[PDB]
């Protein structure tokens, strides 16, 4: 058919969108134990029975967890069984034959979902599909229990029956590239911004201050963030898999943790630095030298490395559950599986402690500003808005993740992986947000204008 363009009209992709790939046994909207791609194991409330049926179907001891290959095999087996079920039935086949490829895919979808007999139960709907009355069949199918139990999927399939096209499912492909370009813009913004900052601090001599040393550290963390973590992550997300190996997977993960930790902790160091610089400027200028600041930076990077590369490369961060073992064994898998200890410890070190210290410090600033040797001016309002942005951005970017990161481990996930990755990236854009917050000094402005000759 000379069709090698993305998204070909078929039953497989339709069902992948409707069901969704999951390797571990889960419960559907009804409550039955499902696995893979909409593969019903048993109607038995016992999970052990589901494991028995699963092991019987696959052909080995799966422990409730299967691989991608087995999932696809089960998928094709169930689709083929659905088709054969349609051809074997006396109510489905006369309808199935008098249907175009798309509507055929819709019928195969229904049979795939609720079995042969159940779909054969739709006397009126099939009687209308056979007479090519798509709208009446749509309205009628919109009055079933199937539409009441799974309204969204029912709406999509019914729409597919009505229009006869793939308009109900074609709206996803556009979303894929639609977020792809966003990822591109993210990488570009981060890299450009941080390279600009680092170059500005490095080249000019008027920007050689301790605060700007901390800014240099932060900008380096965000730079390695935008050059390594973000692009490889984008490639991992878009291509649905991982094509670099387990070693580079755990290495990329190490860079992830290291960069995030270093970034946040450096933000904390900046907060404290500015507190001492504003509250007690003379002691700040006398005590904190460039060497002391360098030692501080070294300490931050060491602590960051101790919570990233060390546990990860020593497999200490690794989990014990079956899916984690499979993913660690799988070369194409690079999902983020950890145990309670590592998740909690890393969350505390990387995010929570710097969060607490920063909140306390800025609160100390706002508090001590009101007890100086002094008319409700507007400068204090502007400063309050400034710190509101400084802390507000950081919070809004990294708080949703580390909370979820601590919730996703305390109990087996009711939190979708989509949300996990999404919030992780909401944390990722903070690296690009930082140069627009910590580099608004007049010297930084002039430097930025001179660097690109605007």
């Amino acid at each position, epitope marked *: 058919d000379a069709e090698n363009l993305y998204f070909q009209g078929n039953i497989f992709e339709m069902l992948r969108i409707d069901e969704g790939l999951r390797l571990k046994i889960y419960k559907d909207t009804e409550g039955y134990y499902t696995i893979g791609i909409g593969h019903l194991l048993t109607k038995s409330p016992s999970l052990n029975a589901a494991k028995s049926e699963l092991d019987k179907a696959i052909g080995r001891n799966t422990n409730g967890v299967i691989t991608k290959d087995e999932a696809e095999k089960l998928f094709n087996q169930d689709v083929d069984a659905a088709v054969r079920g349609i051809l074997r039935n006396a109510k489905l086949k006369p309808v199935y034959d008098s249907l175009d490829a798309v509507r055929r895919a819709a019928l195969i979808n229904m049979v795939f979902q609720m079995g042969e007999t159940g779909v054969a139960g739709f006397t009126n709907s099939l009687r209308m599909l056979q007479q090519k009355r798509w709208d009446e069949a749509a309205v009628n199918l919109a009055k079933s229990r199937w539409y009441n139990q799974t309204p969204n999927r029912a709406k999509r399939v019914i729409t597919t029956f009505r229009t006869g096209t793939w308009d109900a499912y074609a709206a996803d492909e556009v979303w894929v590239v639609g977020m792809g370009i966003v990822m591109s813009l993210i990488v570009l913004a981060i890299v450009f911004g941080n390279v600009l900052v680092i170059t500005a601090i490095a080249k000019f001599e008027r920007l050689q201050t301790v605060t700007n040393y901390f800014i240099t550290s932060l900008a380096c963390a965000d730079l390695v963030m935008g050059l390594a973590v973000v692009p490889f992550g984008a490639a991992h997300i878009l291509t649905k898999t991982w094509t670099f190996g387990n070693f580079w997977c755990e290495f990329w993960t190490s860079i992830d943790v290291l960069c995030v930790t270093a970034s946040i902790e450096t933000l904390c160091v900046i907060a404290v630095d500015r507190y001492f610089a*504003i509250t*007690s400027p003379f002691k700040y200028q006398s005590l904190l030298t460039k060497n002391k600041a360098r030692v501080i930076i070294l300490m931050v990077w060491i602590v960051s490395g101790l919570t990233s590369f060390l546990p990860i490369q020593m497999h200490w961060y690794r989990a014990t559950h079956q899916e984690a073992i499979n993913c660690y064994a799988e070369e194409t898998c690079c999902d983020f599986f950890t145990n309670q200890a590592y998740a909690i410890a890393s969350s505390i070190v990387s995010f929570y402690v710097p969060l607490v210290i920063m909140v306390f410090v800025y609160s100390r600033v706002f508090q001590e500003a009101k007890r100086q040797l002094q008319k409700f*001016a507007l400068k*204090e309002h502007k400063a309050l808005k400034t710190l509101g942005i400084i802390m507000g951005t950081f919070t809004l970017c990294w708080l949703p993740f580390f909370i979820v990161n601590i919730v996703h481990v305390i109990q087996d996930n009711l939190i979708r992986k989509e949300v996990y990755i999404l919030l992780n990236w909401i944390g990722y854009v903070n690296s690009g947000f930082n140069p627009l917050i910590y580099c608004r*000094s007049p010297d930084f402005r002039i430097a930025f204008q001179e660097l690109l000759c605007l």
Partner: nanobody
Amino acid sequence: QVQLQESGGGLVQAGGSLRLSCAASGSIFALNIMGWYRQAPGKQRELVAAIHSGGTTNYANSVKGRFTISRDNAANTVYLQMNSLKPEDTAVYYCNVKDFGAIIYDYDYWGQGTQVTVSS
């Protein structure tokens, strides 16, 4: 968009006393460093004496023990007491305000500058 009114400078005999003064007209952030800098004939701009909004002060190594900086209570006015003046103190004195309203960095406000001449 605030202003700095400097006053007090002038000619003075060697060993005589002089009183500088800077008045900050406008809205300045509560946390600031109000001080005095100077430019000697053929020398770079040097810090004379700065005072923080928290009362604490800071003097140069050539004025410590001779110069004493203080500030007003509510009008944000800084007075610089210059006792036992020397011919090397003959310079151009600028009033200065380090504002911390940006928290991350500091906004600088400068005065028009006053001339001080010590008769050698």
